[PDB]
Amino acid sequence: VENPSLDLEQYAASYSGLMRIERLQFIADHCPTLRVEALKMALSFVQRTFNVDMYEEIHRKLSEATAWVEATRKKALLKLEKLDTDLKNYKGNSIKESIRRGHDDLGDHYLDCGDLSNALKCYSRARDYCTSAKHVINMCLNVIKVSVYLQNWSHVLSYVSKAESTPEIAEQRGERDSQTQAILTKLKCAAGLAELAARKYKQAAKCLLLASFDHCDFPELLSPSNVAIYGGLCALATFDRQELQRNVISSSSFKLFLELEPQVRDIIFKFYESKYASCLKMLDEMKDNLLLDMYLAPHVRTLYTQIRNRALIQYFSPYVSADMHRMAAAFNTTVAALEDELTQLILEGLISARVDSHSKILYARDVDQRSTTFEKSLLMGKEFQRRAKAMMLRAAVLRNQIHVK
């Protein structure tokens, strides 16, 4: 599936830093005619990211499917021993301050080379050596950032709730609105990523809309370009009309995010304005691009289904009888195909209507409260009488001591 509509000028400016190389793992499978160009930039890229055991992975993957180079890998391995020398000095001093200060700066470094297992174990044992309120604040950012890389959330969720409640709700006033690095914006983005991966789109949107663009420019946790995409897709699928208007359209904080991507902004506005033919068309074009997003690929199919289902319910809400020819056109589908979609919606109970497949008109169904109440009350009486007469026979077999040996 070739997608030549992708504007490389905009995409190259959307990601910055380490996220560029990670995307190419899946993209390079079906995007030829750039291997020679990639080698040109590879002269200044082989030394970058301190790759040691990633180099063997890339070349073996395509070779198994369908020595100047090997010299670089062998030479770079010697640098692994040099970094171990700095660790010895801190232990010899036997000073708590010296170890604590250098630990935080050294902690970020093991992440780059690839010692994920070693770096994580340090924070677990260092918790008992931290007693000050400040030391509590710093470790929260570190453990969440590392755990995101290895894709776990059971530990993250446990510490997220405790940190916000145990110290008297973030020390009441918040310790002069935190330090220079505002952590309040960072946990909101982290919570959205954690809840989105937990198949909880409603909570992910809520934790993503409460973010300020002025303090949301960290190219380490999540790109700001797709923050609007995540916060818009999740809110569109889960939030109702009251929640969408109050939390998205009228939200001044989220308006700045929408300026980054005009496509997602127009999709949400068209959905609000009951313009479904145009809104769904833009979603179809964007669907292929979202499939390449690492945090959004598995949720694309379910989010699109929820958005379309919400559109179908909202379309028929102001109608007591709707033409199926106009309804099908508004959803870019045929009358016969739309009839199958409405059959599942009515059976599930999301739409209270019936389909007249002679003139192709969807008639809203108005239930009768009096008739419904009478029939369910008589059914309850019939079931109760059967149950009572069955147990009054059971009292006979229990009294008479009847059983099978």
Binding site: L342, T343, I346, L347, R354, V355, D356, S357, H358, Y363, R370, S371, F374, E375, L378, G381, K382, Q385, A388, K389, M392, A395
Partner: protein
């Protein structure tokens, strides 16, 4: 087939096959006001509008469904209007069920009065 015939309940299983068609047709009433005989036969797998017409007609005769057949357009219309619970016959039905509950209550009260007068009882209470 061997298991069901060995247990001698052959025919009860065949009634399950026929009741599945009725169950599928009854589900059409929860979604449609008017369905073509051909279209209905494709959803319930009856393989023919003539077969669907006979299946629907039998259900109306037995009272399992509330529908009518229109041969002018080849359509089946579902009339979901069982009862308005206003006729005096509904009052008669209510008092028939009420009398059953009253008689049930009389037996329940009488049998616990046998427990109270039991010499074995009240000795352990």
């Amino acid at each position: 087939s061997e298991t069901f015939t060995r247990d001698n309940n052959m025919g009860l299983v065949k009634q399950c096959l026929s009741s599945l068609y009725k169950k599928n047709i009854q589900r059409l009433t929860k979604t449609f006001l008017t369905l073509s005989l051909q279209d209905m036969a494709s959803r319930v797998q009856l393989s023919g509008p003539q077969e669907a017409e006979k299946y629907v007609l039998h259900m109306i005769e037995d009272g399992e469904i509330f529908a009518s057949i229109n041969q002018k357009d080849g359509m089946v219309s579902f009339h979901d209007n069982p009862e308005k619970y206003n006729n005096p016959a509904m009052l008669h039905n209510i008092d028939q069920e009420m009398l059953k509950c009253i008689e049930l209550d009389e037996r329940l009260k009488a049998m616990d009065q046998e427990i109270t007068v039991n010499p074995q009882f009240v000795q352990k209470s």
